[PDB]
Structure formats: C-alpha cells, structure tokens
Amino acid sequence: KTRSSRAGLQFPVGRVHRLLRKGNYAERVGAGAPVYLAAVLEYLTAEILELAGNAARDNKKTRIIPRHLQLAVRNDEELNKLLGRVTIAQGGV
Amino acid sequence: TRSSRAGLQFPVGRVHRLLRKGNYAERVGAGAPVYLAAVLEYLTAEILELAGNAARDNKKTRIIPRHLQLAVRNDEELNKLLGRVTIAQGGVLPNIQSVLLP
Amino acid sequence: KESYAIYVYKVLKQVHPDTGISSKAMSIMNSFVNDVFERIAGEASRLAHYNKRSTITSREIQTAVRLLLPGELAKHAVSEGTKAVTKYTSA
Amino acid sequence: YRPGTVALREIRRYQKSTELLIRKLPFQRLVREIAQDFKTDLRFQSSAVMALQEASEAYLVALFEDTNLCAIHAKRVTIMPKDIQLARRIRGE
Amino acid sequence: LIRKLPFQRLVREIAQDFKTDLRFQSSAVMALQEASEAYLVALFEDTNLCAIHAKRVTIMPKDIQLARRIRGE
Amino acid sequence: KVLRDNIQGITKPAIRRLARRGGVKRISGLIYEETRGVLKVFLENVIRDAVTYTEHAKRKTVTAMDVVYALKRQGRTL
Amino acid sequence: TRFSNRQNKTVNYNIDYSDDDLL
Amino acid sequence: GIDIVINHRLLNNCKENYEFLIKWTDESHLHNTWETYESIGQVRGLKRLDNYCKQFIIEDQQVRLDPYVTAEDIEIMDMERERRLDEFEEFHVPERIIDSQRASLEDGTSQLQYLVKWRRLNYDEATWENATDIVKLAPEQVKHFQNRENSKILPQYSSNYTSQRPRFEKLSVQPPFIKGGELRDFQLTGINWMAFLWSKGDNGILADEMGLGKTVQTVAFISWLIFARRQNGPHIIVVPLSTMPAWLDTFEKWAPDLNCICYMGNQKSRDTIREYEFYTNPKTMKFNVLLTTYEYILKDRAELGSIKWQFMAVDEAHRLKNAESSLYESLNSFKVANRMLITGTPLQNNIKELAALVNFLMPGRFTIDQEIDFENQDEEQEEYIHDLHRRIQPFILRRLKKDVEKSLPSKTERILRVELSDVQTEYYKNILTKNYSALTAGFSLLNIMNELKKASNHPYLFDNAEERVLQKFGDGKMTRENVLRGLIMSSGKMVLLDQLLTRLKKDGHRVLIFSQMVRMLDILGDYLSIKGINFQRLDGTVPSAQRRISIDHFNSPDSNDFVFLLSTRAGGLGINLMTADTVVIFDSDWNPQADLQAMARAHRIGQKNHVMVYRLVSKDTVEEEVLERARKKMILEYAII
Amino acid sequence: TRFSNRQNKTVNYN
Ligand SMILES: Nc1ncnc2c1ncn2[C@@H]1O[C@H](COP(=O)(O)OP(=O)(O)O)[C@@H](O)[C@H]1O
Ligand code: BEF
Ligand SMILES: [Mg+2]
C-alpha cells in the first residue's frame, strides 16, 4: 500500500519527499522524515480546522470562511501566539 | 464508390442488393437505388435533427426513445406519416384536457 | 496546481464534514500549509548544517518541531509523528 | 393539496413516466396461459413478452384517451363502460 | 473599510516615483489594502493603550510617535 | 481641478472608522496628518521592495506574489 | 454539416411542472 | 416640515422684509403658500430658507450690484427664473392618480383623497390629496385614472401561450388602435412582419433604419398583440434613459388609453411604485406595460423576474452584445413568451455579437460558430455568411430611407483633413518620443494611444498646457479675446471649425457637435460661451429632467440656442434633433455604427431638409487607421446584407 | 474522526 496509507496519513508523502529535495533543504533525506513531517502537518491542520469548524457552526454557517478561521486562530493563544505575525485576508479583527 | 460518387452516406450497394433480393421487380434501373438512398437518408436526417432538439431540451447527451416520440408526435407531418406506428419506451405527449383542471 | 485542497477536503470531511469551506479559506489553508512547511524545513536544514550533516532524519524534524512549536502542540505533534513513523516503519 | 389533486399528480407522473405500469410476471403468466389454449407447450423469447407488453399498454392507453373524449362529450367526468363500447364501435372494432 | 480607488491611486503614485512606469494586478492592490488596514488598526490599538495610560480619552499625536518608536523602531 | 488625491484619498471619515475598529474613543484633530505620514512611510517601505522584485523578474507588471514576498518579510520584522 | 431547410414553427419540450395553487 | 420655496418676494433687511412661496414636507406642490420669517418662526428645515436667503442675496448681487453682468446674462437669469417657475407650475399640475381612499380627519369628518403623481415629477412626491382639486384641475386625468384602474389588461387575464402559435400574414390597413398619427406602408409592414414572426412563434429583430418609426411601430405592434393576441400579461420595454420620456410620449399620443408605467428613481420611488402601482391587494399587477432602463432591471432583478412576462422589447438592442453581460444574464434569468430586439443597425462590430443576439432570440437554433468566421476574404466564410444571411432573413426586418421614403432628403457627409498646430506637433512628438521631463512639465505613458489621441484633439487636455501657452503668448491670459485666440489657435481643427461656425452663424444654420471626450466638450462649451454663442450641452452627467427640457427647448422652433453640443455615448443614441440641419464629429470611435447613430440623431422622419455632415480629421494621425478599421467593420455589415 | 489530542478551552464563536 502507498506510503501515506501505510502510515495512515492523508497527505502526499511523495510530494513532500520530493519537495525536500526540490527545496535543497538537504542533498539527502531519510525515509521517516517526510513521513514524520506529514504526520505533524495533518495534526496541525486538524487542530485549527476543528476550532474553525466550531466557529462556522457557532455562527450557524456550514461554510468555513476567513472570519471563522480568524476567530479560531485568535481565540487560542497558542495558535494566536504561534501565528502572531500571520495576517488573514478578509479576516476581521 | 457509388455512394461517394453521389456523396451519400447510405450504402447504395447494399440497397441495390436488397432491391434485387426483395424481388420487387425483374428489372432495377441503376438510378433507382441512388435516388432511394438519397431520400431515405434525408428523411433520417430530418427526424434525427428533431430528436437532437428533443435531447437538448431534455438536456441529455444521449438520444433515447422518449425524445424520438416527443419529436415525431410534435412534427405533424411525421405523426401523420406515423399515425399507426409506436415505439417501446415511448409515451403520450404530456397534456391534460383543460376542462379537467380547476 | 501543486496544491493541498483535496487533502484539505479529506481532513475537512475527516474533522468537520458538516462544514463547507470558502475557496478563500481554502487558499488561506494552502498558504498556511506552505508557511509551516518552509518554517520547519528551513530550520531542520540549518540545524543539519550546524550538525555538519548532509542528511535530514526524523530526529532533526522531531527536534525542529519541538523548537518551533508551542509546548503542548509540540509533544502532541511529536507523539503523532512517532506513532505515524512507527506504523510506517513497522509496516 | 385539495382532494383530486392526487389525480392531477398521478396524471402528470405517469405521462412523465415511460415505464411499464403493470406487474410483469402476472402478464407473462396470463399470456402463456392464453397461448396454451391456442397451442400447448410454447416457449417464449422474453423479448417477445416485452414487445407484447408494450403493444398492449399502448393500445389500452389509446382506448382510454378515446373514452375520455367520449366522456367529456357526455359532459360528465366519470368514464362509464358504455363509453368504452361506443368508442370501440366508432373505431369499428 | 478604506476606499480602493483613492488607495490604488496613491499606490500608483508612489510606484510611479520608483519605476515611473508600472502595471498592477488588482489582487496586488487588494493585498496592499489588507496589509495597510491591519497595520493601522494594530497601531491604533497601541496608541489607544498609550492614551489611556496617559489618562486621556483623546489619543494624541505624541501617542502615535511614542507607539511607533517603541514597537516599530 | 487643483487638489491631489494621494493625501486626500485617505480622509477623516475613513480614519475615524479605522480608529473605531481600533477601539479608539476620541481623537485629536491633529492625528490624521500623522497617520497619513506613517501610512506613506509604511506603504513606501513595502512597494519599493515589490518594485525590486518586479525588476528581478524583468517584468513591467507587479503581481500579488511579489507583494506577498515583500509584505511577508517586511511585515514579520515590523 | 447537415441542416433542415423546411420552414418550421418554434417548439419546445418540457417534462416538468409544479402544483402552484393546489396547496 | 420645511420644504424649499417656489419663489420669493417682498442682510437683516433681507431677513425681515421679504416673503417666500413656501412648500411643506407633507403637502403637495399645490399647497404652496406665501409665508414670512416671523409668521413661520422656527420650523424644522429652516436652513433651507437660509439657503434660499443666501441664494436671494447672491441673486440680488448678480442681478443688481455687479456692473459687469451683461444684458444677455440678465436674459439668461430671467430664462432660469421663468423656466424654473413654469416647471414649478407643472409640478403644480397633476399627471397621474394612483389610487383613491377615504380617510378620517381630526374634525371627525372624512374626505376622499386621490394618490396624485405630478407632472415632470415622480412617486417620491406623489401623495394622497383631496380629489376636490384633482376633479377640477385635470378631469382628463381623472378619466384616465378611472380607465387605468379598470383596463383588465393584467397578468391574470392571459395563459401560457407557448403550446400553440397561430399563423399570421401581411396586411395593408392602418392600425385602428392608434391615435398618434398615420403609419405608412413601411411602419405597417413592420407591424405585419413582427406579427408573422410572432405567429411562427418566434423572437425577432427590427432593423429598418435609425429614426424610421420603430417606436411608433413597436407600440402599434404591442397594441395589436395585446388586442389581437390577448397579450394582457405584463410586457417589459427596456429603453435607454434619455428616450424613456419619448416612449412615454409615444404611448401618451399613440395609445394614450393603455395602462402603462415607467419604472425609475430611488428605492422609495420604486417601492411606492411597486406597492401602489404594481400590487393589487398585496399579488397581481395593475399595469400592462412597464418601461425600464437597463440598470433598473438590475435594481430589481429577481423581483421583476418573478413576473410571468409575455413580451420583452429592447431598444438599442446592441446594448446586448454578449452572453456574459450582466444585462444579458438578467434577461435570460427572466422568462418570456416573446422577444423583440430593435436597432437600426443589427451589429456593431463582429459575428460573435450577432451570434449572441440570435441565441438570445432562439438559443442554439442557429449553427453560427467561430469554426466559420470572417476572414476578410474566404470562399467558405463568404458562402457561410450568405447561408446565415438566408437563414436569418425571415427573422430580420431592414430598410433604408432610400427604400422607405424618398421624400426624406439625403445627407452630405465629408471628412475635413486638418493640420496639427505647433502645440499639437510638439505634444504628439513628445508621445512618440518618451520624454518624462515633458510629462513632468505637463504624466503617464501607460496608454500611449489614448494619450496621443486626446492630445491630437486638443493639447488643453493637459492642464499645464493652458498656462504655458497663454504665458508664452503673454497677452493670452490678459483678456477674454486673447484667451479666445490663444485657445482656438492651438488646434487646426478648432481654427477650421471656428471658421465654419462663423459661416453657419451668418447662415443661421442649426448644428450638432459630437465628441467622444467630455473634457473636449467642456473646452468647446467654454469656447462657445466666451464667443457669446447660444447653445445647449448634453452628456451622460445631466439628469433626466434638465436633459429632457434641454432637448425640448432646442427642438422648439424659437430656440435661439442654435448649437447643440453632445457626447456620443449618451447623446449619440435614440434622440431626434430635427431643428439641426448640420452635424460635425470631432473624432470617430472605433465603431462606425455609433457614428451612424449620431447621424441618425439628426437623420429622422422629422428632418425637414437635406442634412450636411463633417468629420474633423487630423492629417497623418492614427484616426485614419481607426477609420479604416471602422470601415472594415462596415464591410462586415455589407457582407451580411 | 481526525481526533484532536490537545485538551483546550471551550469557545463560543456565535
Ligand atoms: N407613423 C408616423 N407618422 C408620423 N410621424 C412619425 C411616425 N412614426 C414616427 N414618426 C416620427 O418619428 C419620430 C420618432 O422617431 P422614432 O421612429 O420613434 O425613433 P426609433 O423608432 O428609431 O426609435 C417622432 O418625432 C415622429 O414625429
Ligand atoms: F432608434 Be431610432 F434610430 F432613433
Ligand atoms: Mg429606439
């Protein structure tokens, strides 16, 4: 089975494994690294999306929108302080 | 070929072969199958055009019997030509007599 | 073109399938994904160079993420990475 | 929706519909039972049964249209058997 | 909040100073609006913090200068 | 038609709206000219680098991607 | 590449309907 | 509340002594009364009186104290006075009653009020006023209101026709419905052919020449199909703004008994129209026909799209160029039993526009597609364009005056090749050369064609040019005459046209000026005024009433304003200027048909005399290339015919 | 189904 499905991961391990070469980050890359990277990428996006889903749901909207993302991002201090210099286009204060 | 000499699509050779095989007459002049094939494929072109318009109005990629029935009943000339003809998976032209409605 | 929106849709359906997403929000997610990726990768590279290493491994990224990431998110993500690579390698 | 609306709905449904309106196994059973009266032991192409089915439905619906026209001519909405008999006689059957 | 036509005319004026001949994607103008609004609002929140620290309801230009120095410089 | 938009385009009501979004209660009438100046400086800083990005592409047109590059690094520092 | 050249009326096909005032 | 006074009669003297013809916020114009400052006292809106006091002060200053104000400027002030006061008197005459109601008064009595709309005025003013005055001032309007209340020409009186279409064939009789004049064979054959096309079931195009009767023809046809085809359900006529009054006037003369309306104005106006004028017992809609402009469709797209329209009619239908136009979208979100597209030239530019038109008439029915397209000469495209021609011909009506009515005298048309001034040569070179210093001396190169074209008409389109010119003259600034010279010298076309204008002034000829460029039409307005000329301007900026009355006055035979100055985009369309014998164009557009339309603004059923047409063409400049491309576009028209 | 590991403050965004 594919490397992602072997890991159970929902991201293109092959792309990122390629990208690790394509970005010159190192002339060698070890097989777990793109897998480990994909795992944390999935985890990170899940955490934000969960909060943003609550934000849309709380606003009675099915559509997740920048407002709902921004509201989520600023409500978690960790995400907010992690993302303190990220600016959300059409994300209101 | 003869069909290509005429510029027809229909198989002039085939229809000539049938005209012999059908024993319609002891003699079959060479013009007969050309003329017949021409008017035949003209007729099919007509009804195909109408069936295509029916498929467009039903918004379907594939022509199906319903579209044929709709086209052929809607064209008075064809319906007259086909007043005793019917098709599988056809159907009545959707219509209700006004007096039945409130 | 080289974009994650399909993977976003996967995890979106995996996390809140009752929610749609605006293309704007989807693009923001793509920008976000690219930002975090280049952040962790650029760090791990410079750490590897500091360690005089021509290769990047799980340890480098596992260290880099613990450097970049807030303390809870770090150990949670680290555990997720170690679990995932364990499944991958045990397979 | 005001009673009798069901009639209009059924009419528009079945005119929209093309599909067979009658139970197929009863029909095939009946036809082979009749055929046995003409001659025993006939086997059937299933397609033959389908063709007969289509013809039977088409003929019946034609007759029903004819009888509806008669019924409206009588200035009543209920079709009556005498209407069938008239329509059949006018058709010369 | 801020008006795209005036804003983009200002933007083109300043660009015209550096290049003297430009073209712009409308997406670029949008992005500049978003950036400028966010930056200004943040600076307003700072300068308000300054004004209330000085126990004024009005913000004062001194508060802008101070905020810009402390955060920006 | 004598006025020039670059200063005037950013105008008392819009500044008031920005301040209200920034939660400001009241403002001195002097503030607007400071903010226009600051805005010019802020804008001036970013667009210069966008120009140089566009130069390195040798293109006449400036894209949102060039803006994103200039705005990315400059925004994080500021 | 083939076209009718008969004169014809304008005609349209519609299967569908609504029970607007049957309530 | 206070409303702003009609007139004034007898600074502290101005405040104490004088008297003003007030109006009030809740009372119709006929409730005007003479009132005084202390008699009214402090009342809501008194700043309007302050404004009028300031106005009256400056009126006194301009009329009486300023020694420079010339007698003709006093006459223009008297014109402004009497014209506005007469228009206030027109606001004092009703135009329409909308409904009637009886209401209780504070005395416990009751009175019957008619919801009255007023002339030159709309349903923002219109209000319930006691019939006691309506019945004596406009019993004709009372009669018409009682008709419009009761025509039974309404959506509920007609069915869903599309299942059946009976035949029609051409006829030779004057339409009996019509009060407004006398169709000739061509207008009647319009009616006939549209009726035949309807009787095939179809949607059609009318492209008999510009000004040839379409409006009267289309109202006669809509009347015929209402009466003949029982088309009692709503019809929507979409119209360019400037012509909406004329269309109304057509009805108001040709079938004045019809119950039809024009839909315009602020949300309040449109709301009061919808609820009072459209709705019965809010729904079913009182009117048979609604006039609208294009944008007022977008203003109520889904709302008006909720009506089951029986007929769409479209003036200047090339307004619908392509399927993606927001108008084209909205009109195809609407559904209708019939469509009719009116334009004296059926295509401006290109086969794709005509394809979009025919798709709007009969979507997909015509195999018109890029795969065969207008190579300038090609046997295959020339064959297919004649095939499309014969395919469409049953569905288009087209004629010229040359066919229609030889009585209508022809047009002289000529190009006026003219040389650049030195100023022109300098600036044009300074566009050919890339001189940022010259730009800094008076600033963008980002559209060189536009910069050089507008320069080529006039260097004063760069504002520093007027300074540097009149300063290098030195005397130019100093006097009106020196300014006039320093201006007019600066373009050879301006010198030539000034000579021609002086000739026409001696001739007494009446003339239309057209340009693409509003700033040039401003410079020319200033030139006319400093030359002491009597004229009107029109462009897309002037609102409905002032533009309308300007057209009316200029068409009035006593109009001493012998020149009309027009934009092309607004003024070149729809309108008849029958008082003008001559037309001049400063600059052709990319599109020739727009120029033909401008010509049509002179060239009309109403033109008494042979017209003369002149195009001001600068020597050795791009407009010659523009003209050749426009001629190629006309070759496409000649190919489709 | 993509469960979240962190235990975090509940939020109302409405
Ligand atoms: N049947 C007619 N009899 C007399 N005059 C007419 C007739 N039809 C049109 N006209 C004249 O034409 C003018 C209207 O031009 P019109 O034909 O309505 O423009 P278009 O039809 O091109 O939009 C009116 O002023 C009117 O005097
Ligand atoms: F529309 Be017509 F040509 F005035
Ligand atoms: Mg017209």
XYZ file of C-alpha atoms in Angstrom, chain F:
78
model
C -9.059 70.801 -10.563
C -6.351 71.595 -8.091
C -6.293 69.031 -5.258
C -4.185 65.864 -5.395
C -5.676 62.580 -4.244
C -2.708 60.787 -2.689
C -3.018 62.700 0.580
C -6.721 63.440 0.320
C -7.821 59.944 -0.663
C -7.286 58.898 2.951
C -9.829 61.061 4.660
C -11.278 61.960 8.048
C -14.291 59.583 7.994
C -12.266 56.559 6.897
C -9.646 57.328 9.539
C -12.453 57.652 12.083
C -13.750 54.242 11.032
C -10.294 52.709 11.382
C -9.960 54.245 14.845
C -13.366 52.914 15.865
C -12.300 49.494 14.644
C -9.205 50.094 16.734
C -11.462 50.817 19.694
C -10.429 54.466 19.991
C -12.882 56.626 21.920
C -11.933 60.153 20.834
C -9.237 61.684 18.656
C -7.409 64.978 18.429
C -7.936 66.763 15.128
C -4.160 66.650 14.628
C -3.931 62.874 14.397
C -4.890 62.402 10.761
C -1.796 64.050 9.339
C 0.472 61.918 11.453
C -1.238 58.759 10.255
C -1.112 59.772 6.612
C 2.599 60.296 7.025
C 3.006 56.994 8.797
C 0.889 55.338 6.147
C 3.029 56.800 3.400
C 6.144 55.534 5.124
C 4.655 52.108 5.632
C 3.454 51.959 2.060
C 6.696 53.399 0.771
C 8.661 50.702 2.552
C 6.776 47.765 1.053
C 6.317 48.980 -2.505
C 9.990 49.737 -3.044
C 10.829 46.108 -2.480
C 7.951 44.969 -4.641
C 9.441 47.110 -7.381
C 12.782 45.430 -6.962
C 11.141 42.019 -7.075
C 9.488 43.083 -10.297
C 12.857 44.246 -11.569
C 14.409 40.859 -10.917
C 11.628 39.294 -12.965
C 12.343 41.993 -15.586
C 8.548 42.246 -15.905
C 6.626 45.505 -16.311
C 3.715 44.195 -14.248
C 3.692 43.713 -10.476
C 1.871 40.666 -9.144
C 0.275 39.854 -5.828
C 3.020 37.239 -5.401
C 5.679 39.963 -5.443
C 3.610 41.855 -2.904
C 3.400 38.710 -0.800
C 7.187 38.379 -0.803
C 7.804 41.995 0.190
C 4.934 42.016 2.671
C 5.940 38.623 4.164
C 9.489 39.542 5.340
C 8.762 43.275 5.970
C 5.545 42.538 7.939
C 7.228 39.993 10.269
C 10.070 42.471 11.079
C 7.513 45.314 11.584
